[PDB]
Design a protein around this nucleic acid. Structure first.
Lengths: 104, 99, 88, 50, 48, 52
RNA sequence: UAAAUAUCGACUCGAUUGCGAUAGCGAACAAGUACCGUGAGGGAAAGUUGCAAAGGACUUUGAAGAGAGAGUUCAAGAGAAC
RNA sequence: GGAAACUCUGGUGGAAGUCCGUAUCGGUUCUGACGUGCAAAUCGAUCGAUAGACUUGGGUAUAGGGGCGAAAGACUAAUCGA
RNA sequence: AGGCUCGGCUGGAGCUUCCGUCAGUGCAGAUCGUAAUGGUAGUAGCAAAUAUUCAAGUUCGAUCCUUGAAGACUGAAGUGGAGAAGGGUUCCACGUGAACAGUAGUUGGAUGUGGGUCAGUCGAUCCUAAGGUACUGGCGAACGCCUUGUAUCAUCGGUGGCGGUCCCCGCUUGUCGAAAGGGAAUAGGGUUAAUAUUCCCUAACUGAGAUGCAAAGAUUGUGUGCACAAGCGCGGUAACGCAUUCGAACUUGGUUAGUCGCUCAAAGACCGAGCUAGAGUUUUCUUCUCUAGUUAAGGAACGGACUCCCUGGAAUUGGUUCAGCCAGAGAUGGGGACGUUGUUUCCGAAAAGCACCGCGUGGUGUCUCGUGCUCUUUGAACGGCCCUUAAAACACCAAGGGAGGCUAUUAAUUUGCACUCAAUCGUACCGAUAUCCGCAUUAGGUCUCCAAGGUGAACAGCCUCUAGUCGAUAGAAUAAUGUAGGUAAGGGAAGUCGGCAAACUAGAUCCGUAACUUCGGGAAAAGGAUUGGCUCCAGUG
RNA sequence: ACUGGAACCGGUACGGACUCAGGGAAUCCGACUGUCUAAUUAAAACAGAGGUGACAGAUGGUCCUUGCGGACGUUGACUGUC
């Protein structure tokens, strides 16, 4: 078959040297280098993955459209919907109990 | 001129494969790896489990089994009570007749 | 095995070229020249190394400025004057 | 090495310039004694301990 | 190099490539704009 | 290198708007989301830091 | 706080009951050079054609080295490593 | 299967400083080859290990009565009871 | 006697008697120092890595250089194609006589003369790791050392107003150190004797910019073009979706962190069925054998396991994986949301490349399908393990906050297009049985990537394809001794210190397996049977 | 794609090359995996898990440094070293 060669001077199979074999229009098999993949963020409170957020490398986040980094909700893109629900419930109930104790 | 490449034909390999499919060149004297190396029992079990579970899913979706019988047969299949699809179908037919 | 086999692994230079003396005696990890003592302010010379002192002492180079001073001393370091304006 | 430093390249360039046969007309100068370049270097025999 | 070429030969350059030869000589490849003709400029300079 | 787990605890700075994190060896029974009270008026509960 | 005193390391000079190229400084010469050691460092050999290149035109065999003739020269059996 | 305690059978699963074995890392025996060698330690066959107390590149740290040592006075640039 | 005189030949510039005096004053040796030279001797030897032959070319000259034909080898964990360290011109072309290439040489990594390395996107440059080294501070007779730490310490810089300044907000820290860690952004085709992600063509992307153009902002509700009022966006129950309808200091977060195992998916490779095009073979047979039928970066549209949302309320418990596991803390069912990998009857783009047929620059085709316990790489989702828990910085982004900013046809402010620029240094080649280290063209050593067919469990061994080699001084002959292989009647360890060496055993399927035991093992114990080809039968989706 | 079976066929033989432990009964030493005298000793030597003992509650213990100061120590008896 056809065998490939590295196109850069880095000859070691490091995390920065991941490659993929691709067929070119000229009938050649060549090496195309893979960049690091972005990660879907997590909640500040829990660790569950957030939805509606487009993963990307930190420097590439600057190129995304505005809507791909946010969610239309308080703490959107920072907290999960359930985390926000819990925060709202706690905020309401703790202050209600504080008012009751102050009355007492 | 660019000379043609040297010929390396696979004709004998194809003919040998046809014979093997017919059932030749597979006796005990032609085997050099263990039975599990030639065909893993894990792979055979995976195939069997997927076949049986697909059959059970199809029957339950077609309403030929209720959830209770489906659960019982699912667990029996996992417990290695049915050797193949024919065995499972025969058991299902018998149990349905009894019910 | 000490010898022919072991010499095949010698491919990392301990010393490189020194900025002050130009010799290949600058120890990379120690960051110091084994010959002239760079980057110490002072020069590395030892009286037990008489031949080394002779090799690296004054006069083994160009002594451009010392010779210039010697030439200018002969006339009292005169400055601001020119020979008598004359011609051919 | 392919990936080298500018200073090393400069030193190598000077060594390359110095590795050259002596001009032929030098032998015809008055009082000349040099018959050839006695400081020639072969890359495989003598190595520049840089 | 761009400014020197413009000031010496009254020719504009679209790109300049530079390398250093093994003898430590800097060599420049100056691509003139399509308006000018490299052969004509070389004829005027003399090297041809 | 340590056989005992560490507890990362978050306190509120009393003098500026910031959070201060404390790393202390955990007492058995301490759990995430627990509240630790440190001071002279803290009660006798597991994990509290009090004068002897 | 000058002089008388020390000292050739530096610059400039004069000498000699010293050595005469295995000697005399390591180095009479492209010598602290070539070369060696990763490094501190170690460290040579190497003077001589002739008064003057006049350094052998030209012929001849050979692919050539080279040879046979010839020429220069006080002399080349002083022909280049002389 | 059993009153219970629990026992038995068939599968699934894929643990281990587990085993055979290739790349690889070592260097047991032949007391083989060679022994003014291919080689100032190599060559052939046969061998130990081969998913870890594993094998390794680069960068760094430890310098001589000092370092470093799963300990042989071993190793510390063919130099080590200094 | 130490030695001396004279003759002859060579040589070309100095030498000498006698008297005193002085001494670096006499060689056969010192395994003496240094330089040169013998017998050995045309001798030991130039024997690992399978292997060369025929015809021709060039040349004064060919085993060795070149061409063609043949025969072999490496055999994809290569004798192939590229790199890191190291080398430093060894790279390429044209000459070559001597030396070197332990034979030869017309050839060469030799020698003479020239040529050759092109970057906004590949690296360095930038961040910090282990660690190094400064400051002060202490010590030290001193060069200088020690600490990198509340030791030392008066180490500043951020928003806002004003226009240097005042308010407020916090509290202090150096600087080096990785062409394998982190990291802004490029791909295809072509081109040269030698450069190519660098040059040319085509097509993109990132960062820093002012300016210009276009569109937004620039409307809505009610009443009757006018009046009044209205801020800084909308949809969905929700998961979230869509537009660009502001926003600082400060605070809090995100930016896959190990290793092994199993499943699934995508791409590449491989393998089949045809259909074209060209080759090869045809005593005989074969709808036959081989080769080519390719699609980059970047975009648009789709797709996406896991996880999340809504309804509802589950025991006669169900769902569910290969293995798990999940559910009144809300399962099944039904309906939805999100998203990295990726795919295309789409742009790039067939005008390329490839294959073939022509002419002296043309034409034709480049197409339909399958398949998988297959490998490599990527991705998803889980499990096992630890008295082992698997970086730090920079940078970007998000959220909370609401200090502030513009004032319904204005303005602030985003959006899109159009323009300018992107410095410096490396870039050739070898990377090893001849470009590195070993005195050398040395059977040694020296970090990695890609990885075809058959047999087979297999990257094993053996054979082959692409690519590369035939380089190991040659010829004749086959004595003894040898080194390395292959056998041996009958006996079978009698050899020898000793079964040293060699021989014996072995794969796979079925059967069977002792003492002892730490109950796990011993165990492949021991020990038996079977194994090819061909024609069939049955089972397993 | 793999599995089981039956007829027939040949021949010296069917894992037809290739690849790949001879087996067993005992004694001594070391428990095991592992490490080591590079270039004459790979072992019964060293390590090892396990056992015991010693010191140390920090104003401490054990070490280094000429000194300043520093290491175990981002440690605190289930710890640290011996």
């Amino acid at each position: 078959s056809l065998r490939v060669t590295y196109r850069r001077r880095l000859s070691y199979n490091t995390t920065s040297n991941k490659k993929r074999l691709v067929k070119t229009p000229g009938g050649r098999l060549v090496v195309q280098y893979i960049k690091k993949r972005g990660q879907i963020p997590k909640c500040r409170d829990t660790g569950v993955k957030l939805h509606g957020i487009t993963p990307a490398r930190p420097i590439a986040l600057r190129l995304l459209k505005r809507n791909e980094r946010t969610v239309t909700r308080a703490y959107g893109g920072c907290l999960s919907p359930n985390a926000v629900k819990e925060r709202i419930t706690r905020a309401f109930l703790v202050e209600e109990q504080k008012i009751v104790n102050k009355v007492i | 001129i660019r000379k043609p490449v040297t010929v390396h034909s696979r004709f004998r390999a194809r003919e040998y494969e046809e014979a093997r499919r017919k059932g030749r060149h597979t006796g005990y004297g032609k085997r050099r790896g263990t039975a599990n190396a030639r065909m893993p029992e894990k792979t055979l079990w995976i195939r069997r489990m997927r076949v049986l579970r697909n059959l059970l899913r199809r029957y339950r979706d077609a309403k030929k089994l209720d959830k209770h019988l489906y659960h019982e047969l699912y667990l029996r299949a996992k417990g290695n009570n049915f050797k193949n699809k024919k065995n499972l179908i025969e058991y299902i037919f018998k149990k349905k007749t009894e019910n | 095995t000490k010898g022919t086999q072991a010499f095949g692994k010698k491919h990392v230079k301990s010393h490189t070229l020194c900025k002050r003396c130009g010799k290949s005696s600058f120890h990379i990890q120690k960051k110091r020249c084994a010959s002239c003592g760079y980057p110490d302010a002072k020069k590395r010379t030892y009286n037990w190394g008489a031949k080394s002192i002779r090799r690296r002492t004054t006069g083994t180079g160009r002594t451009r400025h010392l010779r210039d001073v010697n030439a200018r001393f002969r006339n009292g370091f005169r400055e601001g004057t020119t020979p008598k304006p004359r011609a051919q | 090495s392919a990936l080298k430093k500018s200073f090393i390249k400069r030193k190598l360039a000077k060594k390359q310039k110095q590795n050259r046969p002596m001009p032929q007309w030098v032998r015809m100068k008055t009082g000349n004694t040099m018959k050839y370049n006695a400081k020639r270097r072969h890359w495989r025999r003598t190595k520049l301990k840089l | 190099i761009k400014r020197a070429v413009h000031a010496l030969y009254n020719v504009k350059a679209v790109k300049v490539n530079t390398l250093i030869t093994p003898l430590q000589q800097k060599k420049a490849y100056v691509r003139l704009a399509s308006d000018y003709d490299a052969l004509d400029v070389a004829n005027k300079i003399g090297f041809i | 290198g340590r056989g005992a787990p560490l507890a990362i605890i978050a306190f509120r700075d009393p003098y500026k708007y910031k959070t201060v994190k404390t790393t202390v060896v955990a007492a058995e029974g301490m759990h995430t989301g627990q509240f630790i009270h440190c001071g002279a008026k803290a009660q006798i509960q597991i994990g509290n830091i009090v004068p002897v």
